From a paper:
Later, Hop2 and Mnd1 were found to work together as a complex that promotes homologous chromosome pairing and DSB repair during meiosis. It greatly promotes the Dmc1- and Rad51-mediated strand exchange between the presynaptic filament and recombining double-stranded DNA (dsDNA) to form a D-loop, suggesting that this activity of Hop2–Mnd1 may be responsible for the synaptic complex formation only between homologs during meiosis. In order to provide structural information of the entire Hop2–Mnd1 complex at atomic resolution and to understand the mechanistic aspects of the Hop2–Mnd1 function, we have determined the crystal structure of full-length Hop2–Mnd1 derived from Giardia lamblia. The structure reveals that the WHDs of Hop2 and Mnd1 are closely juxtaposed via evolutionarily conserved interdomain interactions—thereby forming a joint dsDNA-interacting interface—and attached to an elongated, crescent-shaped Dmc1-binding structure.
The heterodimeric complex of full-length G. lamblia Hop2 (231 residues) and Mnd1 (203 residues) was crystallized subsequently. After extensive crystal screening to collect suitable X-ray data sets, the structure of Hop2–Mnd1 was determined by the single wavelength anomalous dispersion method using a selenomethionine-derivatized crystal. The asymmetric unit of the crystal contained three copies of Hop2–Mnd1. Only one Hop2–Mnd1 heterodimer, referred to as Heterodimer I, exhibited electron densities for nearly the entire length of the molecules. The N-terminal ∼70 residues of both Hop2 and Mnd1 fold into winged-helix domains (WHDs) that are juxtaposed to each other through conserved interactions. The following 161 residues of Hop2 and 131 residues of Mnd1 both fold into three α-helices that are interrupted by two short non-helical regions. These α-helices of the two proteins together form a parallel coiled coil that provides the major interface for heterodimer formation. Finally, the C-terminal segments of Hop2 and Mnd1 fold back onto the C-terminal leucine zipper (LZ3) to form a helical bundle-like structure, which is designated as LZ3wCH (for LZ3 with capping helices). With these dimensions, the overall structure of Hop2–Mnd1 is an elongated rod, which is curved due to the two kinked junctions. Presumably, the overall curved rod-like structure observed in the crystal is likely to be the inherent molecular shape of Hop2–Mnd1 under physiological conditions, while it is conformationally flexible at the three junctions to some degree.
Residue numbers in the entry:
A (entry chain B): 79 to 230
B (entry chain A): 76 to 203
The structure:
């Protein structure tokens, strides 16, 4: 019935509708993105609130730090090392002293005690407490470089 | 056959109207939404900050968590013990310098031999 006229038109618009629908959905996508974002006045708020909220923690850190309420990993290392240094310095200077006191005792053929009494050398503390101190709290070795690594 | 193929053209006209009105509603809603939200170097440099800060927080609370790991009772225990040991190390230092006095000015021993025997070194000092 020369329906080519009409059966062509369907094809024409079957192309047209499709175009708009495949364009249509695109709009939807972007508007979704638009509905999922805050305005630029509210986003300007939330930021100057977060700024204050962060600055807050910077102050809390400044305080608990300045008050020595807390110990940093580097500091906890440094005290730890300084301890080794002292307990070493101690156990060392005692020894390299009492070993000379040894020779010098029988040099004069006399007890070490009275030698220390004459020269005016101090009793010391006992090693009873030193070793029980190493026991209580064990010294450890701590590299200076380790301490630099903790400080960053 | 003819009308059967005529109906398929009656479906797509209605479909086109519906799709057209839909697109209209869409462009409208965007037109209203793009009002508050407007892409700018400002809003751009802004969203980035609402993230930056947001993250910096999580970093901070991590910092805290980690900072509290360190027992200050121990820090003090250490602090006290070392004070003790250093006063003791300073004691035996004083005893060593005293043996230097006697050995040098009484037993007239060797100023070279004395150092080496006592343990006196370069930069031998009290612990401050």
């Amino acid at each position: 019935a020369q329906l080519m006229e009409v059966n062509a038109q369907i094809n024409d618009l079957k192309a047209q509708v499709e175009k708009l629908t495949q364009q249509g959905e695109t709009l939807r996508i972007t508007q979704r993105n638009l509905e999922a974002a805050p305005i630029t006045e509210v986003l300007k708020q939330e930021v100057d609130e977060l700024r204050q909220q962060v600055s807050a923690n910077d102050e809390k850190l400044r305080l608990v730090r300045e008050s020595n309420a807390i110990v940093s990993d580097a500091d906890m290392l440094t005290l730890q090392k300084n301890y080794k240094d002292a307990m070493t310095a101690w156990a060392t200077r005692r020894a390299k002293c009492r070993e000379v006191i040894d020779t010098l005792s029988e040099g004069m053929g006399v007890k070490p005690s009275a030698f220390m009494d004459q020269l005016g050398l101090e009793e010391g503390l006992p090693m009873t407490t030193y070793t029980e101190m190493k026991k209580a709290l064990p010294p450890v070795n701590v590299s200076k470089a380790d301490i630099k690594a903790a400080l960053k | 056959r003819s009308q059967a193929a005529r109906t398929e053209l009656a479906r797509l006209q209605k479909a086109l109207e519906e799709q057209t009105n839909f697109i209209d509603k869409a462009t409208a809603r965007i037109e209203e939404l793009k009002v508050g939200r407007e892409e700018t170097e400002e809003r751009s440099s802004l969203l980035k900050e609402k993230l930056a800060l947001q993250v910096k927080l999580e970093e901070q609370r991590g910092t805290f968590r980690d900072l509290l790991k360190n027992d200050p009772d121990v820090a003090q225990k250490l602090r006290n013990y070392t004070d003790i040991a250093k006063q003791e190390a300073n004691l035996w230092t004083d005893n060593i310098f005293c043996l230097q006095k006697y050995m040098l000015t009484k037993l007239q021993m060797d100023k070279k031999t004395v150092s080496t025997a006592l343990g006196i070194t370069g930069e031998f000092d009290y612990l401050e």
